């Protein structure tokens with residue numbers, strides 16, 4: 189109930205929203221059906237259009253007009269945006285040569301440059317190039333400011349998940365908006381685009397920018413606009429707030445456009461009807477910049493031009509139906525479309541088994557256009573598991589396709605030609621970033637980066653301290669002229685032991701067996717003292733950021749940090765030069781495992797546990813294949829280099845170590861490799877403590893990893909070898925799930941050269957992802973600036989074409 193019979197006189201677009209049943213005059217009132225009786229009349233004026241004309245110049249002020257061409261209008265802050273162009277002989281902002289903005293050029297009484305976020309739904313990254321002839325204002329922003337060739341959205345590449353990530357710096361799994369449509373078992377409530385329940389505050393976690401501003405004494409314009417408020421009115425409102433007295437004037441604002449997403453859905457991303465929406469958007473930017481120019485704010489305000497996701501070609505005929513796979517299709521609920529989420533129709537149904545559903549959806553048709561997953565088996569890069577609102581069964585849908593439950597669903601709703609929501613590494617889902625103003629750089633191109641990083645930068649631009657979030661603060665310092673955030677490296681929490689030879693061979697009873705001169709004895713001892721360490725540890729040893737007990741172990745070919753708690757390395761580091769040669773494991777050494785006389789029997793794995801464990805075998809972190817000599821090859825068979833592996837995963841690992849490491853060393857002019865295990869049994873993307881481990885090698889205290897990582901580093905200038913690099917670095921990394929079968933890879937019964945590298949590409953990762961998962965901090969000792977290293981650690985190698 190609203191007493192909609194109060195009034196909006198003097199209250200139009202009120203910054204503080206008022207409490208029911210008293211009527212509302214804020215930019216969201218329409219959406220709640222709660223505006224005052226007179227809202228349309230006083231706040232949504234249209235009389236005489238949106239532009240001044242020759243005849244309107246110096247007119248007598250008429251309050252009924254949409255915007256004004258009278259003399260006083262500038263003081264009042266309510267001129268039409270073209271007033272000075274038409275009535276005072278001024279040029280449009282787009283027609284002015286651009287000039288570097290070295291410092292904020294603001295009116296007296298501004299305490300900080302204001303920030304305007306101009307957000308656009310479904311603005312695909314390639315429109316910057318492809319639509320460049322019809323977007324001259326945006327093109328001026330882009331070429332004169334700081335721009336990225338594209339920006340990476342979060343998964344799923346839907347509107348609310350992405351808008352709310354921009355606002356908060358958080359993964360959907362942490363902020364809680366995990367979809368456009370959602371079911372929450374704890375509330376027993378649903379969240380939908382149509383309807384009331386989305387307005388409820390319990391859906392929305394983290395701390396969005398407007399709340400971060402307010403709490404720290406920075407005033408915010410209201411970010412959200414009702415769909416029926418026209419674009420010109422949104423602009424004029426923002427220009428109006430900017431004219432308020434110093435004590436009431438907001439410092440941060442948002443504009444939002446429904447376009448080009450709205451038309452993209454109907455016509456596809458490049459439909460010929462797409463030109464017009466792009467024209468209209470550019471026109472709106474023009475109006476803003478002309479309006480800012482009139483108020484002398486065009487060299488004062490920082491402007492961010494940002495999209496939420498791109499748009500892909502999708503039609504009705506490209507639909508996969510679950511009714512073609514499952515005979516039980518009525519016992520499941522599906523959240524459908526560009527992703528699939530499956531739960532049980534009824535929790536009272538005790539016959540429902542996710543395992544049998546997964547199996548029935550796996551590699552059934554030769555060109556199947558989706559892949560089922562338990563959510564914890566999804567690529568770690570998506571960060572899409574740790575929320576009770578994300579269903580245990582997920583379907584990753586191929587770009588260009590839809591998944592539905594039954595054919596009836598599609599033709600009882602062909603309509604659409606565009607959709608979005610696929611994997612966030614897909615080119616067509618990529619979106620835009622342009623920064624323009626005194627705080628951004630001038631005429632600068634920056635590399636692609638993820639939208640989770642922006643909250644920190646908007647905090648920096650406003651002098652705010654950010655709420656805890658998933659950005660890496662400082663990784664975007666290269667976008668900024670000043671207001672950079674200078675972080676310090678985290679401090680090491682545990683220091684390592686450096687054990688010497690302390691145990692006799694016969695003290696080991698491990699069920700392990702192996703068939704195994706002063707010049708070359710002083711030699712091998714210095715190798716064990718760490719003489720080649722500078723070759724294999726190029727960037728310093730990683731720092732252990734938690735409390736634990738570990739050893740540094742040195743060898744001719746590799747160095748490791750060996751965990752006495754988990755009985756295996758946390759990390760193993762080695763360098764493979766361009767010229768290195770692959771050998772095989774000799775026959776006399778096939779089943780060789782050797783005791784490590786630096787490490788107590790009690791802190792060692794044992795062969796008897798692997799013999800007993802019928803499902804579990806073992807592999808090596810440093811590959812024996814890449815030993816630098818027959819004598820150094822013995823080091824690779826030490827029990828301290830051993831880790832548990834399913835026979836199915838060994839096929840993956842062996843191919844990576846035997847074939848791919850050498851391949852990258854040739855292509856890259858040497859590589860440094862750091863490999864290790866990851867334990868994430870509760871799928872929170874964070875390192876498990878020992879009491880969190882759900883699985884051990886049978887009859888032993890040997891914990892089983894959920895994943896294995898590798899970080900592969902070389903010189904960005906590939907004419908220099910990896911161990912003699914003078915400048916910036918180049919990285920690619922992966923987090924491979926440690927699985928007892930290869931069901932994920934439909935081609936797996938073929939040769940490894942046909943499926944392994946594809947799987948690895950899918951499980952590509954940022955070094956930062958690996959840091960969360962291990963509690964390690966890499967690249968401690970380089971010659972490079974720390975901000976540059978933070979950017980390197982947030983890099984993702986996506987394996988998409990240009």
Ligand SMILES: *[C@@H]1O[C@H](CO)[C@@H](O[C@@H]2O[C@H](CO)[C@@H](O[C@@H]3O[C@H](CO[C@H]4O[C@H](CO)[C@@H](O)[C@H](O[C@H]5O[C@H](CO)[C@@H](O)[C@H](O)[C@@H]5O[C@H]5O[C@H](CO)[C@@H](O)[C@H](O)[C@@H]5O)[C@@H]4O)[C@@H](O)[C@H](O[C@H]4O[C@H](CO)[C@@H](O)[C@H](O)[C@@H]4O[C@H]4O[C@H](CO)[C@@H](O)[C@H](O)[C@@H]4O)[C@@H]3O)[C@H](O)[C@H]2NC(C)=O)[C@H](O)[C@H]1NC(C)=O
Nearest residue numbers: 361362363364392393394574575576656657658872873960
């Ligand atoms: C991305 O960045 C984010 C933000 O930094 C990272 O997430 C943080 O991770 C922390 C570690 O998981 C976590 O810290 C916990 O906080 C608990 C208090 O939490 C409340 O307060 C915060 C701050 O105001 C608030 O933001 C939280 O909001 C969450 O919950 C509501 C829903 O309930 C949502 O509206 C909101 O979206 C958010 O949900 C998300 O987070 C929770 C986890 O908190 C998930 O479960 C959800 O699925 C969703 O992802 C909260 O309202 C605090 O209680 C915890 O303390 C326990 O654990 C520690 C171990 O150190 C121990 O000392 C304590 O004893 C305590 O254990 C007790 O409770 C256990 C469970 O009940 C029990 O088993 C024990 O026996 C003990 O009794 C803990 O400190 C922090 O909340 C989140 N923050 C956010 C915003 O998510 C995230 O990790 C980053 N991701 C990556 C990959 O880096």
Ligand SMILES: Nc1ncc(-c2ccc(C(F)(F)F)cc2)nc1Br
Nearest residue numbers: 305307351354355411412413442444
């Ligand atoms: N109607 C709407 N009006 C505004 C927004 C919006 C969401 C997020 C942000 C950002 F980027 F700052 F976080 C700005 C504006 N979304 C919708 Br939907």
Ligand SMILES: [Br-]
Nearest residue numbers: 348351352355
């Ligand atoms: Br939002």
Ligand SMILES: [Ca+2]
Nearest residue numbers: 868874875876
């Ligand atoms: Ca974990």
Ligand SMILES: [Cl-]
Nearest residue numbers: 346367368369
């Ligand atoms: Cl969804």
Ligand SMILES: [K+]
Nearest residue numbers: 798801804805
């Ligand atoms: K075994």
Ligand code: NA
Nearest residue numbers: 930931933936
């Ligand atoms: Na397979």
Ligand SMILES: [Zn+2]
Nearest residue numbers: 310347449453
């Ligand atoms: Zn859309």
